[PDB]
Design a protein around this ligand. Structure first.
Ligand SMILES: O=C(O)CCCC(=O)O
Lengths: 520, 152
């Protein structure tokens, strides 16, 4: 997921700019976004949200707007229990478990339902589960006493000022997410939100693993107020952003650093290349227009290539295998952008899978390690070019096997197929540096692949008066059997041809295709 | 200077555009939420009902084996019961909007029984607590505490 908020001073017309760009699975049901527009005499909200939610998480109206990315707030703890004498050892003594005998019905293949017993054991920590390996784990989830999640989002998106907005956020009812804000008043904001347990020791990595469940020493009970969390408002840079990267480069120049917060809040790992493109695209550009802003969102740079090809190519060219040489020349001529016509893209990917692991996040193979002091220009280079060339050798085999050739056109193999619409793909994996994202699936017997996750709801809003907004939903606004609104937007996505989002009554009335009057 | 004058809807109606995007207009909050619930049932009714069913911890009951792991995960963490509590702990105003949302879904299924998939019919009628349950499952037992990280 990507998120951008531009301050007036950094734009041409003087109105804030906002980008809603959540990345989620295209198939998981509870991750499906829906686009809607609500209007009553006292408020207006437009935007997308996961199906089933009565409130719009990615919203905007004539006054303000927000967006969300994943920050992974470690809001729960998995404790390893030390079983002993029917109970579990805690603070030197054997404590008994809380036991409740519950049950549920299991539907049978014949239509009937068998009654199945379910025992629920709990430690002072929380519910206990037994992993397949035999490890007894107790999960303690923070914020179970915050029932106002839905109303907080509702009050946040209907806020009449940044002040009211923050006040709503301060209730700490939304347990996670990075949230970005922007309004017609000119304020932009980034907030590493969520309910974080107050701890006296241990870094995030410690709390992300199995914490010892045999001592009150690790039993947290309180949570941090909104003021303890990393946040940025109107920074000197004139923008804020987050692309799932740790909250350490929310803007440029930064307004804080890791040392300013407890070490268990977020990680301090190398920022993905997409995240880096994000910081560059915003900081490097000034006097932005809505159009230019939109154009920047389409960025699909093979950043990984700029970091490795200068070292890989020369090394490959000296290899005796003529095919490795040809591959080297093919990659050398590539403009390093994931376009439909790129004959080198697929090949580069395959090598990347080996050079940096399947998820493309591996760091072990760079000559210069990542550094927060050079957050958008590291890691760099190839550590062992000889090895890398072997990896390329293997990649050539893999590319030919998967696609039938080392120089197959990216867009010929990468397709976006919904119902009977089959359009050419572009852009790609975020970890390779592509900002606009399409996590392509493995190919089928014919080398064809489609998006498994990536761009879903995408909108860019300018808070002028009236506001101007554009957007697109990859998989349409409906998945009900036989609907014509599932595959009717993917063709436009393939051309980055965005729809103007209609907020004004007159605009709506002009585009209405169906009227459903109702009464409650 | 000041935002463009807001629209004052004088009747409850949904204006759908060419892409299936619903523009829900209500004379008040509850009305708009009802409209929102109707639209969602229209566009994603089957999966919403199924998910709501799971949030009740009825996954194994309604659809068998393939939904049993999630049922155990949600029951052991008392999600469906906590959803009842959270629902009851809502401010009267907002609880009214949630009731309206569920009513909109029920209403749509009522007026369009043919659009609802057989397997998820038994879920109906849905309630405000169901809306709370699902949201509670999505936030705390999917995003924050996934069953994968606990079990491995
Ligand atoms: O907030 C959301 O809707 C989830 C998507 C964020 C991400 O996965 O980065």
């Amino acid at each position: 997921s990507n998120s951008w908020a531009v301050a007036p001073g950094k734009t041409a017309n003087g109105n804030a700019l906002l980008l809603q760009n959540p990345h989620l699975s295209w198939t998981t049901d509870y991750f499906t976004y829906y686009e809607a527009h609500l209007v009553t005499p006292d408020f207006e909200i437009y935007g997308a949200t996961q199906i089933g939610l009565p409130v719009i998480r990615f919203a905007f109206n004539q006054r303000m707007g927000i967006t969300n990315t994943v920050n992974g707030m470690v809001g729960a703890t998995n404790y390893r229990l030390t079983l002993q004498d029917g109970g579990y050892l805690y603070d030197g003594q054997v404590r008994p478990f809380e036991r409740r005998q519950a049950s549920y019905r299991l539907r049978q293949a014949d239509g009937s339902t068998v009654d199945k017993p379910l025992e629920i054991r709990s430690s002072v920590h929380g519910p206990v589960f037994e992993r397949a390996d035999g490890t007894a784990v107790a999960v303690r989830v923070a914020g179970l006493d915050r029932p106002g999640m839905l109303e907080q989002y509702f009050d946040m998106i209907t806020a009449h000022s940044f002040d009211d907005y923050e006040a709503a956020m301060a209730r700490m009812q939304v347990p996670t997410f990075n949230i970005v804000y922007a309004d017609r008043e000119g304020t932009i904001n980034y907030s590493f939100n969520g309910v974080a347990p107050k701890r006296a020791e241990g870094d995030i990595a410690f709390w992300q693993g199995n914490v010892p469940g045999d001592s009150s020493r690790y039993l947290w009970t309180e949570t941090h107020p909104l003021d303890d969390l990393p946040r940025v408002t109107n920074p000197p840079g004139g923008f804020v952003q987050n692309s799932n990267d740790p909250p350490w480069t929310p803007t440029w120049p930064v307004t804080y650093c890791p040392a300013n917060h407890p070490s268990y809040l977020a990680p301090q790992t190398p920022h993905s290349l997409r995240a880096q493109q994000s910081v560059r695209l915003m900081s490097e550009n000034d006097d932005l227009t809505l159009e230019r802003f939109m154009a920047l969102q389409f960025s699909h740079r093979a950043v990984m290539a700029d970091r490795t090809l200068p070292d890989l190519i020369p090394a490959a060219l000296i290899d005796p295998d003529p095919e490795v040489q040809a591959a080297a020349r093919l990659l050398a001529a590539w403009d390093r952008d994931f376009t439909s016509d790129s004959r080198a893209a697929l090949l580069f990917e395959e090598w990347a899978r080996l050079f940096a692991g399947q998820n493309f996040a591996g760091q072990a193979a760079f000559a210069t390690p990542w550094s927060l002091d050079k957050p958008v220009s590291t890691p760099y280079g190839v550590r062992d070019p000889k090895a890398a060339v072997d990896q390329l050798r293997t990649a050539i085999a893999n590319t030919k096997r998967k696609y039938g050739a080392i120089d197959r056109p990216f867009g010929d193999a990468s397709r976006m197929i919904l119902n009977d619409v089959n359009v050419p793909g572009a852009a790609g994996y975020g970890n390779l540096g592509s900002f606009r994202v399409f996590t392509w699936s493995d190919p089928d017997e014919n080398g064809i692949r489609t998006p498994v996750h990536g761009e879903t709801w995408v909108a860019m809003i300018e808070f002028s008066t009236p506001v101007r907004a554009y957007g697109l939903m990859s998989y349409g606004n409906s998945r009900q059997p036989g609907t014509t609104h599932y595959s009717d937007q993917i063709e436009r996505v393939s051309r980055a041809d965005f729809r103007e989002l209609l907020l004004r009554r007159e605009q709506v009335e002009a585009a209405v295709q169906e009227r459903t009057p109702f009464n409650f | 200077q000041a935002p463009i004058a807001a629209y004052k809807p004088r009747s409850n109606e949904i204006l759908w555009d060419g892409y299936g995007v619903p523009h829900i207009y209500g004379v008040d909050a509850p009305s708009a939420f009802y409209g929102y619930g109707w639209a969602q049932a229209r566009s994603h009714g089957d999966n919403i009902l199924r998910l709501y069913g799971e949030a009740r911890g009825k996954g194994a009951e309604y659809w068998g084996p393939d939904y049993e792991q999630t049922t155990v995960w949600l029951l052991t963490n008392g999600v469906p019961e906590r959803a009842q509590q959270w629902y009851a702990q809502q401010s009267p105003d907002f609880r009214a909007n949630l009731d309206a949302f569920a009513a909109g879904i029920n209403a749509y299924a009522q007026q369009n029984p043919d659009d609802i998939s057989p397997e998820v019919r038994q879920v109906l009628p849905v309630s405000g607590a169901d809306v709370v349950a699902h949201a509670h499952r999505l936030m705390n037992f999917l995003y924050v505490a996934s069953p994968g990280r606990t079990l491995g």
